[PDB]
Design a protein around this ligand. Structure first.
Ligand SMILES: CCCCCCCC/C=C/CCCCCCCC(=O)OC[C@H](O)CO
Ligand SMILES: CCCCCCCC/C=C\CCCCCCCC(=O)OC[C@H](O)CO
Ligand SMILES: CCCCCCCC/C=C\CCCCCCCC(=O)OC[C@H](O)CO
Ligand SMILES: CCCCCCCC/C=C\CCCCCCCC(=O)OC[C@H](O)CO
Ligand SMILES: CCCCCCCC/C=C\CCCCCCCC(=O)OC[C@H](O)CO
Ligand SMILES: CCCCCCCC/C=C\CCCCCCCC(=O)OC[C@H](O)CO
Ligand SMILES: CCCCCCCC/C=C\CCCCCCCC(=O)OC[C@H](O)CO
Ligand SMILES: CCCCCCCC/C=C\CCCCCCCC(=O)OC[C@H](O)CO
Ligand SMILES: CCCCCCCC/C=C\CCCCCCCC(=O)OC[C@H](O)CO
Lengths: 398, 397
């Protein structure tokens, strides 16, 4: 029970619980009678909570409560709120409980990486090694949810609420484990996220980056709300655990990434992630698992998801850091996260969801598919292509 | 993972939770600057929740919620409320969260009895078996709290909050364990008493109601002052050694039926009374300075359970015997709500400010910050006078 290894367990569980439910959710909702647009709103809960929680963390670190004491009760509230949500037959009863849970979860991200940062001897020695534990625990929820139950004699739980239950149980666990976590002190103008960072848009490169990133987030939201549903509808078994190849891919390919970034330069690497997200979505157009070649395309798409994340998200953060004034880089990160990764995420979810029910929903299933999945992946791949070319020509740097 | 045993674990943890924090709370509250009165109110919280709880259980099921799901929700709520309370530094912050926790909790008791009752095949065979598991869990909390932390190299937790955190953790556990629980399905506030209020016109029933109302006020002295006294008298692991009363209740249950058939309910009721009196006398004279004092201390813990069985169960038996068969459960609810509930409330607070105002030592001497032996005198002959008042004023058949 060493203090640093304590930190690692709490990181692991913290992202374990978000994973346990985020990935399977579509299958249980479509099967329990939701429609594409209801489901889109359900995944939009995520983006709303993301953009709204800096406010909440102003509330939640401002007051004298130290982070570990807070995380215990936010975790307990989350277990309660989502158990309640998990028992919901309807969209009307289900949605507000998901939004409530989401609001009490997303501050914990900050809480937990605060407690890791404060109580670790060397930041560059231990912080990275703590924060990959988050990815590890995402993996663990995935394997627990797509592989473990079948190992004990049960069938795929993805079309059922048990993932919703796993997350609740894990919340409960992290709650109790917050007793044994070291003391972490906390650390009032609401306008910090935006106004600090809005006047950085005047630089041309920064604006093209900002708005092409914001466009990026909307097709890229298709993956998180549809990949598992489609993967299983097209015949891949244990899809919710096989999707951890994107996580393993991120982890392992990022060692290869810095040597990339040196040899080619940020504009090349920024659009390289773009092109492999395009390629990946194409793989999802044509893959359908009946034959080994289409199956291989499925797996390769998941791989290049982690490749694509490493190419774009991490260098993007770097770019903002080297490109922003030091007092203001935390502000700018807050900002691009806020709209790009928050409003672009919401746009992605609901654009895609109502677009599916309006233009793709099958009236009666054909060959196991109740959606023209290939068609939507193709929409998104095409749109990635043409936002990508704009960024190729509308922006340049050295 | 069988319906047979799943309920047993449920009852175990369910009363484990009440036990964890209830016995030790005095030590920590007192050792964090509280006063005897604020402590009295704190123990009174649980009685208030008991008082107000049928209201909450009459709104729990009316909206068609399955007992196991709502229980999961309530255990989670109690975990959170208990953590908050446990991080509290003064009575003003501590009290409201305790009251909230308790209100979340004591509907759980009913709920868990519902869930247990529904899903055993033979209820008169297998219900008692689940009922003992609650007291066994209460035993487990005692032991785990006043014995296990020394085993791991840590000093006594009874003066710290940790009981409070142990409570939170077990709340969270039973909460999660409610997922695996079998399915148990489910508006006049007046129903709990007015049914039974008209029963009081029998004079024996009034005498019994009134004198158990009196009896329950001294009787609360034990729960609120016993651990503090026992430890301040130098008994170590007191919080664990106090489970002997629980044990003795369990084992003395087998000698109860043959006791209750041999002299009736008058003698056996006041036998409950008398053993509670004399064990209070043992409390007035025991200490650990000498071996014999020590022997008194342990015997007084045993006589708790003996006194409890006698009174608490043959009284229930008496009202069932004495109540019309629709109204018997209403009758239960009434005497448990005012006698066991209001009497407890007034015992806790009466004693709290009693010791605050007329028993607090300016400067602790011989380890004692109170004239404990004085309070036990007060209580023991309060028991005595109520005992004789009962002695002549109550007739049987
Ligand atoms: C009151 C009116 C006065 C005018 C108001 C401000 C002028 C408008 C432009 C401001 C850029 C502000 C920062 C100027 C320097 C920016 C450089 C920067 O962004 O960081 C450098 C980084 O290394 C990249 O390579
Ligand atoms: C929300 C994070 C929990 C962290 C632990 C907090 C530490 C101090 C707690 C409460 C002081 C306010 C007293 C509240 C009075 C009752 C509230 C209704
Ligand atoms: C680090 C991995 C920890 C593993 C955590 C696993 C949590 C879910 C396990 C089994 C689901 C139960 C399925 C039962 C179906 C009814
Ligand atoms: C250590 C973190 C990993 C595990 C943490 C929580 C473990 C899973 C909890 C509940 C699964 C309940 C499944 C429900 C089965 C009944 C239907
Ligand atoms: C009935 C008893 C008190 C009044 C309850 C309501 C008013 C609270 C004042 C009494 C109180 O509990 O605080 C001081 C008391 O003398 C020790 O704490
Ligand atoms: C204690 C509850 C046990 C679980 C039973 C769930 C039954 C469905 C809930 C309906 C009300 C929804 C309220 C949503 C308000 C936000
Ligand atoms: C007998 C039932 C077994 C349940 C086990 C939980 C009981 C409490 C656990 C640890 C308390 C000691 C922690 C001391 C750390 C200071
Ligand atoms: C089920 C049983 C769960 C018991 C959880 C006990 C936690 C005590 C640890 C206390 C550490 C904090 C000291 C202040
Ligand atoms: C200012 C106080 C006014 C009086 C308040 C009344 C309450 C009782 C008071 C004192 C009894 C304490 C005396 C305890 C006897 C000590 C005897 C002793 O010295 O040791 C024991 C024995 O001798 C070993 O062999």
């Amino acid at each position: 029970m060493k203090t640093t290894a304590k930190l690692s367990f709490m990181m692991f569980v913290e992202w374990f619980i978000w994973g346990a439910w985020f990935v399977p959710l579509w299958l249980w909702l479509s099967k329990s009678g939701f429609s594409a647009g209801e489901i889109g709103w359900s995944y939009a809960c995520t983006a709303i909570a993301a953009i709204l929680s800096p406010i909440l963390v102003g509330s939640i670190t401002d007051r004298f409560f130290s982070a570990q004491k807070v995380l215990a009760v936010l975790m307990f509230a989350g277990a309660l709120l989502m158990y309640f949500a998990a028992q919901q037959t309807t969209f009307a009863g289900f949605f507000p409980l998901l939004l409530a849970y989401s609001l009490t979860y997303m501050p914990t991200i900050a809480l937990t990486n605060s407690i890791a940062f404060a109580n670790v001897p060397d930041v560059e020695r231990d912080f990275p090694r703590i924060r990959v534990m988050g990815t590890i625990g995402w993996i663990a929820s995935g394997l627990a949810c797509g592989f473990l139950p079948q190992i004990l004699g049960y069938a795929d739980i993805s079309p059922t609420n048990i993932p919703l239950l796993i997350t609740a149980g894990s919340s409960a666990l992290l709650g109790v484990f917050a007793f044994f976590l070291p003391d972490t002190p906390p650390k009032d103008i609401k306008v910090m996220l935006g106004l600090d960072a809005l006047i950085l848009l005047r630089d041309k490169n920064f604006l093209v980056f900002f708005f092409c990133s914001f466009l990026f987030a909307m097709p890229l939201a298709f993956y998180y709300i549809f990949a598992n549903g489609y993967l299983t509808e097209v015949g891949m078994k244990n899809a919710t655990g096989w999707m951890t190849l994107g996580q393993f891919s991120e982890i392992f390919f990022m060692l290869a990434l810095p040597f990339f970034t040196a040899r080619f330069g940020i504009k090349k690497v920024l659009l390289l992630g773009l092109v492999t997200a395009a390629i990946r979505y194409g793989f999802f157009i044509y893959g359908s698992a009946d034959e080994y070649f289409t199956y291989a395309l499925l797996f390769l798409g998941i791989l290049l998801h982690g490749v694509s994340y490493d190419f774009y998200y991490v260098t993007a953060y770097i770019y903002v850091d080297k490109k922003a004034p030091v007092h203001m880089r935390t502000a700018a990160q807050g900002l691009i996260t806020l709209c790009c990764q928050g409003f672009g995420s919401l746009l992605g979810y609901r654009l895609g969801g109502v677009m599916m029910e309006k233009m793709f929903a099958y009236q009666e299933p054909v060959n196991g598919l109740t959606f023209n999945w290939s068609g939507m992946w193709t929409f998104g791949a095409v749109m990635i292509a043409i936002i990508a070319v704009l960024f190729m020509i509308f922006f340049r740097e050295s």
